[PDB]
Design a protein around this ligand. Sequence first.
Ligand SMILES: Cc1cc2nc3c(=O)[nH]c(=O)nc-3n(C[C@H](O)[C@H](O)[C@H](O)COP(=O)(O)O)c2cc1C
Ligand SMILES: Cc1cc2nc3c(=O)[nH]c(=O)nc-3n(C[C@H](O)[C@H](O)[C@H](O)COP(=O)(O)O)c2cc1C
Ligand SMILES: [Ca+2]
Lengths: 176, 175
Amino acid sequence: MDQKQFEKIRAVFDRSGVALTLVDMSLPEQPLVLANPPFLRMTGYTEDEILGFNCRFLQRGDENAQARADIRDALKEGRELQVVLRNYRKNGEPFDNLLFLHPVGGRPDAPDYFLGSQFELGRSGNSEEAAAAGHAGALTGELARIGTVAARLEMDQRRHLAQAAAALVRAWERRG
Amino acid sequence: MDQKQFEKIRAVFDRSGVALTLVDMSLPEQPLVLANPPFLRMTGYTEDEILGFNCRFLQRGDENAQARADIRDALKEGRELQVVLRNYRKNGEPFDNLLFLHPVGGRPDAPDYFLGSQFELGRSGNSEEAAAAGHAGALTGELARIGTVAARLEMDQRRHLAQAAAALVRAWERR
Ligand SMILES: Cc1cc2nc3c(=O)[nH]c(=O)nc-3n(C[C@H](O)[C@H](O)[C@H](O)COP(=O)(O)O)c2cc1C
Ligand SMILES: Cc1cc2nc3c(=O)[nH]c(=O)nc-3n(C[C@H](O)[C@H](O)[C@H](O)COP(=O)(O)O)c2cc1C
Ligand SMILES: [Ca+2]
């Protein structure tokens, strides 16, 4: 909750062209504390409907049982994760979501935040793999700007996140 | 373009994680006027060694003939383009370069500058198409920050440049 740290992330979020969210890991309930305009456009919510609340309102019923188990594990362990979720907009229209999770701040044993970035699937025609990799590359630029990914390491992280995203998209496309 | 706006581009260039170059379109020589650290690391040159030269110093002979004709047409017409070039570092090391070109400033079909961004091929292991699409997405973020890609177009531009990049990789991998 360092002041310089929070506003530094806020400014990056406000300007970014990719959906970004930030959750406060200082409480078990993990409330959302930042959500930027691209995320708001995706989901159909206002900043006030979501800020101070956990991110699970995007789901309905229990269709992401495995993904939820994996997210819980990654959050508790402070690990990066990429995973596809079935989500719903405020108006109820369903959409599939490649979610990128990244720990921010604190120490490897205990980050202060987790950053979320959501890539909407099913709106990139024949090129879901490339568009998801494109999103991973834009996201990595934002991580570098926040400071979470070091400058000397940005190209490796971009390669890694882009291949991980394409691989997950390949699996999602062949599931059905 | 006003000096204030030029320094805004320079600031983006200086802190970008992707290679970026800027070419002055107001002279037929088309000299390089900005070249950022990732570009300098990839090519092996210093700023003093390359600013004021046309970017073709990275090429040799009559190589890339079709790509060069396509570039000349894109520059003349003020259009975007993506193409793969065989290039050489200062020490002579050959490398293949997926080049993105984007017009900057001026008026349509007469930009003040052209922006170039270079993705080095064959350095990304098993995931060449994904790494190149990743570069295209990072690049699109920098275009949005300079203002040359409108806010409402950025998501579509990112998908499009990623698709073009991966298609060019696939074509390259077939040779
Ligand atoms: C930064 C961050 C962003 C998240 N974004 C989404 C999201 O966009 N959609 C979604 O369904 N879950 C999202 N989640 C996950 C939920 O908030 C929750 O952590 C996850 O569903 C685990 O399930 P459970 O705690 O309800 O069992 C996000 C989590 C974090 C930490
Ligand atoms: C912004 C910009 C960046 C360029 N970057 C490269 C480059 O990295 N490598 C290269 O071989 N050519 C690059 N070029 C291309 C050459 O500068 C030149 O336009 C191209 O070779 C075609 O012209 P020519 O046939 O007269 O050489 C770039 C051009 C522009 C406008
Ligand atoms: Ca920058």
